[PDB]
Structure 1
Amino acid sequence: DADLAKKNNCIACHQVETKVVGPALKDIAAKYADKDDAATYLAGKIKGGSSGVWGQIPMPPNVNVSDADAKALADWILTLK
């Protein structure tokens, strides 16, 4: 989980409670990934990147990782809650 996202990049700029570049994880999730399938929806926002949805620096096009590894990360978030 942690080492996974960190292994890739999500944790690189998305911590669990604190944030460095953009918003932290517990927040992004409780921000939109706390209702319906926002995980996949937002997953669309992830690949689409963000510019003025939060206020931090604009994140590049990074979905999660690859095919399953990425899907596993997004899930790790829904579970991160």
Structure 2
Amino acid sequence: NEQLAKQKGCMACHDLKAKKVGPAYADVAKKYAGRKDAVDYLAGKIKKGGSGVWGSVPMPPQNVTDAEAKQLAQWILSIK
């Protein structure tokens, strides 16, 4: 956990409690913490990228698979 975001380099904009170029993973988690499919949705935009729900900066695409996409929404959501 955690070390994963490094191998990818998502912190370049995201941030647990630091609203930087991207919505702090902690903030997004709470926003999707009251949901039940935050895993599919998130990962759905993780392998696609883009934007429109938090801003416009088309986040750069990534090379992850469904499984990896799950750990991202599961690891980012658990973060508060």
TM over 0.5: yes
Query: Aligned partners of 1:66 and 1:44: how far apart in 2?
Result: 10
1:34–1:10 CA distance, 2 compared to 1 (3 A) = farther
Structure 2 counterparts to residues 8-23 of structure 1, below 5 A: 8-23=8-23
Report the Cα offset of residue 33 of structure 1: 4.6
Give the alignment's Cα RMSD to 1 decimal: 2.5
My pick for the range that moved more, 12-21 or 47-56, is 47-56
Contact 2:29–2:77 under 8 Å retained in 1? yes
Q: TM-score, normalised by structure 1?
A: 0.69
Aligned-pair identity (%): 59
Helix, strand or coil: the match of 2:17? coil
Q: Deviations over 1:38-60 (max 9, x none)?
A: 12222112223233321252202
Structure 2 counterparts to residues 1-81 of structure 1, below 5 A: 1-55=1-55, 57-62=57-62, 65-66=64-65, 68-81=67-80
Contact 1:2–1:11 under 8 Å retained in 2? no
Unpaired stretches in structure 1, ≥5 consecutive residues: none
Q: TM-score, normalised by structure 2?
A: 0.69
Read off the aligned partner of 1:77 and give its amino acid letter. I
